């Protein structure tokens, strides 16, 4: 269960969605691979 | 450049943060591995 996506900035319409908060070192625009463990 | 974290619900204080929006299939509470590609 894995996917690829780009980090993005949270906006008012994102409130209520499921997210992983991204830390410093990884910026908006970066591509990340997310895999459920 | 990788980390492990739990999916969480976006709230009003998360507006402005960097996030990956998580799709259906992965829920709040799930542990995921995030790796910059």
Residue numbers in the entry:
A (entry chain A), B (entry chain A): 6 to 42
Wording from the paper:
Here, we study fold transition between distinct β-barrels by protein engineering and structural biology technique. Here, we discover that the previously reconstructed ancient DPBB sequence could also adopt a β-barrel fold named Double-Zeta β-barrel (DZBB), as a metamorphic protein. The DZBB fold is not found in any modern protein, although its structure shares similarities with RIFT and OB. Furthermore, the reconstructed OB fold could also be converted to the four-stranded SH3 fold by a simple circular permutation.
To test this assumption, we conducted the reverse engineering by replacing segment 1 of design-13 and design-16 with the 8-amino acid sequence forming the Z-loop of design-2 (the 3rd generation mutants: design-18 (tkoL2_v1.2_Z) and design-19 (mkaL2_v1.2_Z)). The crystal structures of design-18 and design-19 revealed that they adopt the DZBB fold even without the α1 region (segment 2). These results demonstrated that the segment 1 is sufficient to archive the fold-change from DZBB to OB.
